[PDB]
Design goal:
With about 30 residues, this protein is largely without helices or strands. It has no helices and no strands. The protein has one domain.
């Protein structure tokens, strides 16, 4: 299931909750 915006998860729209969207997933790192 999706949830996105979190970490490694994906970006939702292009503006994470947690990290920083790498291109295609949130760069929590």
């Amino acid at each position: 299931k999706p949830k996105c915006g979190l970490c490694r998860y994906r970006c939702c729209s292009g503006g994470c909750s947690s990290g920083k969207c790498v291109n295609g997933a949130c760069d929590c790192s």
